[PDB]
Amino acid sequence: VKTAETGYMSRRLMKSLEDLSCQYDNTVRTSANGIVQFTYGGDGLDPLE
Amino acid sequence: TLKYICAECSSKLSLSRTDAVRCKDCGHRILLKARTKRLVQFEAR
Amino acid sequence: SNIVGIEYNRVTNTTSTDFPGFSKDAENEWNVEKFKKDFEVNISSLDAREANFDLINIDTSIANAFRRIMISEVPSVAAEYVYFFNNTSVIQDEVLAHRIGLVPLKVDPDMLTWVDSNLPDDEKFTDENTIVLSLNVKCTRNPDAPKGSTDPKELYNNAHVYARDLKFEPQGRQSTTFADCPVVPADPDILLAKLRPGQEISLKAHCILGIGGDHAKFSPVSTASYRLLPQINILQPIKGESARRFQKCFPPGVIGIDEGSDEAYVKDARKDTVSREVLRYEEFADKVKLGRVRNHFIFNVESAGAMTPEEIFFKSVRILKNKAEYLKNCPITQ
Amino acid sequence: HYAKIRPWRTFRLNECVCTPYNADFDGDEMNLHVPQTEEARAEAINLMGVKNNLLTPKSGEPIIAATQDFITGSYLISHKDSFYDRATLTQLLSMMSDGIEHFDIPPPAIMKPYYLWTGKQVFSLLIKPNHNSPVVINLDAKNKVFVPPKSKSLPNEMSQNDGFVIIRGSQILSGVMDKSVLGDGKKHSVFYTILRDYGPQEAANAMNRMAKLCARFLGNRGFSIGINDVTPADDLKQKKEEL
Amino acid sequence: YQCAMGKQAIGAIAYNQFKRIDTLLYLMTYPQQPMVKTKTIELIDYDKLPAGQNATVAVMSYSGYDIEDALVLNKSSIDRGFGRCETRRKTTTVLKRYANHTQDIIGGMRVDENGDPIWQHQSLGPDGLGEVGMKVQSGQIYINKSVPTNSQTQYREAPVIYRGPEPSHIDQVMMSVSDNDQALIKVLLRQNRRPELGDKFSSRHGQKGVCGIIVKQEDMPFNDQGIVPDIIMNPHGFPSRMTVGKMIELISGKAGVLNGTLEYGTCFGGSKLEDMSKILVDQGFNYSGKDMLYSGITGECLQAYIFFGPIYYQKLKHMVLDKMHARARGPRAVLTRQPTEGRSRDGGLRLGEMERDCVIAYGASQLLLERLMISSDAFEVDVCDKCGL
Amino acid sequence: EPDREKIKLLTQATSEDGTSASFQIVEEDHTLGNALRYVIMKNPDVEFCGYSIPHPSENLLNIRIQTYGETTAVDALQKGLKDLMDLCDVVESKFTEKIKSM
Amino acid sequence: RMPIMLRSNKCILYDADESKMAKLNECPLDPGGYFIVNGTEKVILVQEQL
Amino acid sequence: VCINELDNWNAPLIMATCGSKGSTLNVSQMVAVVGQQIISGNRVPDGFQ
Amino acid sequence: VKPIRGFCQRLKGKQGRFRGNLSGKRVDFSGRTVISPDPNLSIDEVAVPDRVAKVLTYPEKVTRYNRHKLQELIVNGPNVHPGANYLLKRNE
Amino acid sequence: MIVPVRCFSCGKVVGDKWESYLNLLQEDELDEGTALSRLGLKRYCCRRMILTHVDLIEKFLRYNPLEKR
Amino acid sequence: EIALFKYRKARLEPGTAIGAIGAQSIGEPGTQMTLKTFHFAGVASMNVT
RNA sequence: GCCACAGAG
Ligand SMILES: CCC[C@@H](C)[C@H]1CC[C@H]2[C@@H]3[C@H](O)C[C@@H]4C[C@H](O)CC[C@]4(C)[C@H]3C[C@H](O)[C@]12C
Ligand SMILES: [Mg+2]
Ligand SMILES: [Zn+2]
Ligand SMILES: [Zn+2]
Ligand SMILES: [Zn+2]
Structure with missing residues (x-):
């Protein structure tokens, strides 16, 4: 039964977070060019790297 | 050509063009087509 | 040593060690005269549908090749x-x-x-x-x-x-x-x-x-397999009632108690299916050790009835020799 | 993935890759799409490739690494009482490379009685086969089960049961290979170090060598579980009863 | 999980299973009763119509192909009938009589110029219904139904065409008359299937798994007597799942088959382990069922004893022949002009919201455009620049 | 007339002087590779002999032979094949004389 | 017309030996308890209520 | 007291040491006492009166 | 009475236009099969059945670097696996 | 449905031992574990082949469609 | 040189869909989470969700 | 075609 609620949670989270991206000036912005974060996580470091 | 088997009385019988789909020796209305006489080849595996 | 030691939890020394580079002596080079002198065949039973024979002083690879060719290569x-x-x-x-x-x-x-x-x-x-x-x-x-x-x-x-x-x-x-x-x-x-x-x-x-x-369906043998010759070493004499218990850890014909000294001795190690039951009991620890001779194979070839087992084994040896000859005669393409 | 063509009517993938999919071979069905344009093909192979995605973006830890039955075989090779002569060493080295890679046999760890190579030297050759391979990785890591040494002054590698693994150059000087060093979830693993220092291709090559070795070694060196491994000893049934 | 998968095991259905015409019926050629029984098995007469075979299992890591529940099968064991099964399917047709005093007909056999039936009618017979016992491939006809067009009337051809990945043999043809005096024709087609890669096997303790590799007998391990396991199962399935009952089943079955009597695995009881250990040690085997096996590849002794004995395995109804599907281009829906749904309609696989979002997470813009526009529903349209319509 | 497709020398894996080589042999499996491995390792000049079946679906066998500078790998392979022939001949002779003995 | 449950007291297979089961092309080990409607054998499942 | 007594080359012990499959708890449950059964954080609820 | 499929019913839900046909949709050139292990493949490889590979095709445009290869594939045809199923001409 | 011709594991022919096994159980009143050994079924893989066999052919033949039942 | 190279390659590359990555990296542990009973710092009467 | 349950991971 946990998958039924977890799928909806994931769908909501993605439909709220899909538009963000890291621009070429290292500022995370929405699709409407509004800043969410000035640097990603405060230091601009990739969690993958 | 005898081609059909009554499913109850097990009598080989043939159907013409105007014959009803029922056995002649009894009232059973289920007929099974008999095995063909043509060669069938199988691989023994 | 060429004895596969059998312990209570593991099997030790299972690999062949006869090649130069195993030690500084650099012995055990391939000599066909030494192999001709050392190799031995002893047939113990020969029926029309089953043959039992020991191959002695041969490597595991060749015996396994014979077994595999008998099972899946003899037409x-x-x-x-x-x-x-x-x-x-x-x-x-x-x-x-x-x-x-x-x-x-x-x-x-x-x-x-x-x-x-x-x-x-x-x-x-x-x-x-x-x-x-x-x-x-x-x-x-x-x-x-x-x-x-x-x-x-x-x-x-x-x-x-x-x-x-x-x-x-x-x-x-x-x-x-x-x-x-x-x-x-x-x-x-x-x-x-x-x-x-x-x-x-x-x-x-x-x-x-x-x-x-x-x-x-084309395999000529119902079964064709070998087993190493078992070897039981009694390091210390076992006397009295314990010997009777020591008799019960093996199949009935394997070991026996001498009537004079009333001590147990190995009678026929060939009958010993290695169940290592004697290793369960603490009283026989540091008194008996079990092993298998690594280069002593007991082939048991049962035919399916088409042809004799000795013919099957001979055909397997001939097939391996023909494989080697065919590979020798081929040209190597770059 | 790059496609290979096989005749056996099932999709087949390496078992190191079933962990990102959360997949087990108990009836799982998977899907296969084929991009139909050059741009889509290049984007898929350069952004979604297995080599370029060895690490999960959730934490940066490896997610494509040794799974079950590859950790066990590697542990049994790298066990402290594993000694191989030159024939078994050479067969193992050919078993991880399809008989193609050139191997430079190092001098043995034991010389006077016989010539015996430890399995840690086998994995040292697995990481770096010859002098032409560029993979030179150095790391220190703890295993899953680490038993600290007798004295607190002693270093971690002088512990019992080979808890601490040290790799200098490419030789494995201590420790065993387990889920901490070859598996997923830890940032001190061998494959993570190879990927970070020498690119994803060398990490993929090392993983392929490990998988090919452990897919053929554990059959010839058997590993089994029975009820003898589960039954308790005689005194345990009394200590448990009294407690 | 065993309660779930026992209802999907392939085996004998009933004593009249060959007189039945069912829409889907899986039968096993050589069913065997379990070596380790239960009182419930005797009470419900499950041993009279069993579903599964006693396979010689060596619990060991053989290749890399047994990882993650996958099983290693023996090719020689499959060649001798292990896991052999058959699938029987029913196709039914009704020769309905329309209100215009017109009815469907069955006869028809388009003979060629030489005097032989055409390829589509190669196994169709003179009466219009396919001959019993002959092989039907994809594209052939086994029911040659014709429908009057106005519903001397003219009949259009609406035949029943077999289609599938493998050929099938016509097992039974039956004609009868329903309650409303309309002719009913049923054709039961059988096809024989052997285990392959992807076929699902269960082991009556959960422990489900598909076949990962099929290897020859000489590549398999063997004991002193030459016994070769039929199924090799990975040891790594036991510790996380804790099926000690499976090991007890193996030892009970081994001791029973050496002693010659079926054993009982009855809940809160059954055959005790000490008696089976005594039986095993009296027969020259180890008390724990761990035999010493030589490997078939290199011939040397395995450096660990192998847990070796008979386990009852069930072949489940999920086989890869019924699951494989591929589309490329095919039919499209009339409304949305997108690929249809299901492999019965040659449909396409859905790239849902989660997969779309996973593709987004990689940043692959062109791949997303190709998957969601080019390959699914691309359409060239004319838009006005002024009114925007 | 000779079978050109039977045994091949994989150019990308051999050495320049022919000391190390890898040969691809078609339509063989462990029953010949293991015997060749055992026989070739008894050559005093061979320091590496190992076979492999890259995939069960392919009936193929890759065998790698690396020697010292005394002889090339091709000579080691030919010597191993001849020596395996001699081993089979000796086993054949002993078995066929012990059949006639009893 | 009431569709009768197989192997009930109104069925033809009630207290019938194995020979009569063979005469009627019916398996003696069939559990019974279902209704044959339009050729399909349907089972009325047990319902759980307060 | 169960884990410290099992000898080497014990397959569940090896598989727990590797981390390939299983844990110490599973071995202890198979060889020794299974332990308390916990439902919703508590012990077994009073199904009857 | 079953409620009719109005215009709003065609747009809402998981089977509507937005979630069933716009955000995600069924695609061509896809296949689904049971998976089984194969350790001999590299980690960046997947093994596809030859039956599936003869259905799933890739449209390769003829260049000056691959003309002979595609000629050979056309000669082999749809039945031999290293072949081709369709040809589309430049002017057609 | 009928006794298999060959043992699945090894390949020994056990299809000719079914009638003899039934005769030794029925006429000689031997126990099931000794009749198997008297027929040469020494390996347990062969013993399970006819010890666990269910002869469903006799039950299937009661519903003969070629002859009144 | 190694430290500076590792730092300069660890920056978040422009164009990354970092919002989708975060949404997935939050949703997926929700799938992996099993439901357990917790308490607030050693007292059993809290049962904080 | 629409519903209805049945299963697979
Ligand atoms: C074309 C191949 C012929 C081959 C299969 C024939 C021709 C020569 C035959 C052997 C010799 O007769 C010597 C022996 C006689 C014993 O009685 C049985 C075994 C024995 C080894 C024979 C086996 C077999 O019968 C051989 C090899
Ligand atoms: Mg699964
Ligand atoms: Zn009649
Ligand atoms: Zn306009
Ligand atoms: Zn057998």
Whole structure:
């Protein structure tokens, strides 16, 4: 039964977070060019790297 | 050509063009087509 | 040392150590004279369907190659194609064809020729590469059966279709080549099918020769396997009642108690299936050790009935030698 | 993935890759799409490739690494009482490379009685086969089960049961290979170090070598579980009873 | 999980299973009763119609192909009938009589110029219904139904065409008359299947798994007597799942088959382990069922004892022949002009919201455009620049 | 007439002087590779002999032979094949004389 | 017309020996308890209520 | 007291040491006491009166 | 009475236009099969059945670097696996 | 449905031992574990082949469609 | 040199869909989470969700 | 075609 609620949670989270991206000036912005974060996580470091 | 088997009385019988789909020796209305006489080849595996 | 030691939880020293580079002495180079002097064969039993023989002072790779070639590379003759005329049984045609293909045929494989696959079916099967077996059984009610009987062998006429009903139909020169050795199944009592009145079976089976790797029905051996010679060392004498307990850890004929000193000694290590039961009991720790001789194989080759087990082993050795010769004669393409 | 063509009517993937999929071979069905344009093909192979995605973006830890039955075989090779002569060493080295890679046999760890190579030298050759391979990785890591040494002054590698693994150059000087060093979830693993220092191709090559070695070694060196491994000893049934 | 998968095991259905015409019926050629029984098995007469075979199992890591529940099968064991099964399917047709005093007909056999039936009618017979016992491939006809066009009337051809990945044999043809005096024709088709890669096997303790590899007998391990396991199962399935009952089943079955009597695995009871250990040690085997096996590849002794004995395995109804599907281009829906749904309609696989979002997470713009526009529903359209319509 | 497709020398894996080589042999499996491995490791000049079946679906066998500078790998392979032939001949002779003995 | 449950007291298979089961092409080990409607054998499942 | 007594080359012990499959708890449950059964954070609720 | 499929019913839900046909949709050139292990493949490889590979095709445009290869594939045809199923001409 | 011709594991022919096994159980009143050994079924893989066999062919033949039942 | 190279390659590359990555990296542990009973710092009467 | 349950991971 946990998958039924977890799928909806994931769908909501993605439909709220899909538009963000890291621009070429290292500022995370929405699709409407509004800043969410000035640097990603405060230091601009990739969690993958 | 005898081609059909009554499913109850097990009598080989043939159907013409105007014959009803029922056995002649009894009232059973289920007929099974008999095995063909043509060669069938199988691989023994 | 060449003794595979057997412990209570693991098996030690399982790999061959006879090659230069194992130590600074750099001995055990391949010498055909030394191998000719050291190798030994001892046949202990030789029946028409089962051979037991010891190969001594040979490496594990060669014996395993012989076993594998015996199982899946020595050709044998078995039914391959089945043509059906009016199979009215409960048993399906696929199942009946598979069962007929699984019967062993008493045919010498050297009297046939390999079937060329790319040839078309009109000329694929000739008198040199195909044995025809015809089966024709019709079951009818017994008119004079006992009233109180219930055995189908008495109530019906041909209620049991066996493998001995597979008659041999010579074609062409097989009328003269197979005159003194007619094709019969190796196990005539194989129960192929069961019938009831009104049912009939009639079929023609084309039998060719193939290897066991292609299908398991072509394997000439029902089983073909070896086992290392067991070895039981009694490091300290075992006296009295404990010896009787020491007798119960092994099969009955393996060890015995001498009547004079009343101590246990190994009588026949060959009968010892290695169950390592004696390693369970703490009293026999540091008193007995178990092992297997790594270069002492006891082959037990049981034939399926087509041909003798000694012929099977000889054919396996010849096949390995021919593989080596064929690889030696080939040119190496860059 | 790059496609290979096989005749056996099932999709087949390396078992190191079933962990991102959360897949087990108990009836799982998977899907296969084929991009139909050059741009889509290049984007898929350069952004979604297995080599370029060895690490999960959730934490940066490896997610494509040794799974079950590859950790066990590697542990049994790298066990402290594993000693191989030159024939078994050479067969193992050919078993991880399809008999193609050139191997430079190092001098043995034991010389006077016999010539015996430890399995840690086998994995040192697995990481770096010859002098032409550029993979030179150095790391220190703890295993899953680490038993600290007798004295607190002693270093971690002088512990019992080979708890601490040290790789200098490419030789494995201590420790065993387990889920901490070859599996997923830890940032001190061998494959993570190879990927970070020498690119994804060398990490993929090392994983392929490990998988090919452990897919053929554990059959010839058997590993089994029975009820003897589960039954308790005689005194345990009394200590448990009294407690 | 065993309670779930026992209802999907392939085996004998009933004593009249060959007189039945069911829409889907899986049968096993050589069913065997379990070596380790239960009182419930005897009470419900499950041993009279069993579903499964006693396979010689060596619990060991053989290749890399047994990882993650996958099983290693023996090719020689499969060649001798292990896991052989058959599938029987029913196709039914009704020759309905329309209100215009017109009815469907069955006869028809388009003979060629030489005097032989055409390829589509190669196994169709003179009466219009396919002959019993002959092989039907994809594209052939086994029911040659014709429908009057106006519903001397003219009949259009609406035949029943077999289609599938493998050929099938016509097992039974039946004609009858329903209650409303309309002719009913049923054709039961059978096809024989052997285990392959992807076929699902269960082991009566959960422990489900598909076949990962099929290897030859000489590549398999063997004991002193030459016994070769039919199924090799990975040891790594036991510790996380804790099926000690499976090991007890193996030892009970081994001791029973050496002693010659079926054993009982009855809940809160059954055959005790000490008796089976005594039986095993009296027969020259280890008390724990761990035999010493030589490997078939290199011939040397395995450096660990192998847990070796008979386990009852069930072949489940999920086989890869019924699951494989591929589309490329095919039918499209009339409304949305997108690929249809299901492999019965040659449909396409859905790239849902989660997969779309996973593709987004990689940053693959062109791959997303190709998957969601080019390959699914691309359409060239004319838009006005002024009114925007 | 000779079988050119039977045994091949994989150019990309051999050495320049022929000391190390890898040979691809078609239509063989462990039953010949293991015997060749055992026989070739008894050559004093061979320091590496190992076979492999890259995939069960392919009937193929890759065997790698690396020697010292005394002889090339091709000579080691030919010597191993001849020596395996001699081993089979000796086993054949002993078995066929012990059959006639009893 | 009431569709009768197989192997009930109104069925033809009630307290019938194995020979009569063979005469009617019915398996003696069939559990029974279902209804044959339009050729399909349907089972009325047990319902759980308060 | 169960884990410290099992000898080397014990397959569940090896598989727990590797981390390939299983844990110490599973071995202890198979060889020794299974332990308390916990439902919703508590012990077994009073199904009857 | 079953409620009719109005215009709003065609747009809402998981089977509507937005979630069933716009955000995600069924695609061509896709296949689904049971998976089984194969350790001999590299980690960046997947093994596809030859039956599936003969259905799933890739449209390769003929260049000056691959003309002979595609000629050979066309010659082999749809039945031999290293082949081709369709040809689309430049002017057609 | 009928006794298999060959043992699945090794390959020994056990299809000719079914009638003899039934005769030794019925006429000679031997126990099931000794009749198997008297027929040469030493390996347990062969013993399970006819010890666990269910002869369903007799039950299937009661519904003969070619002859009144 | 190694430290500076590792730092300069660890920056978040422009164009990354970092919002989708975060949404997935939050949703997926929700799938992996099993439901357990917790308490607030050693007292059993809290049962904080 | 629409519903209805049945299963697979
Ligand atoms: C074309 C191949 C022929 C080959 C299969 C024939 C021709 C020569 C035959 C052997 C010799 O007769 C010597 C022995 C005689 C004993 O009685 C049985 C074994 C024995 C080794 C024979 C086996 C077999 O019968 C051989 C090898
Ligand atoms: Mg699963
Ligand atoms: Zn009649
Ligand atoms: Zn306009
Ligand atoms: Zn057997």
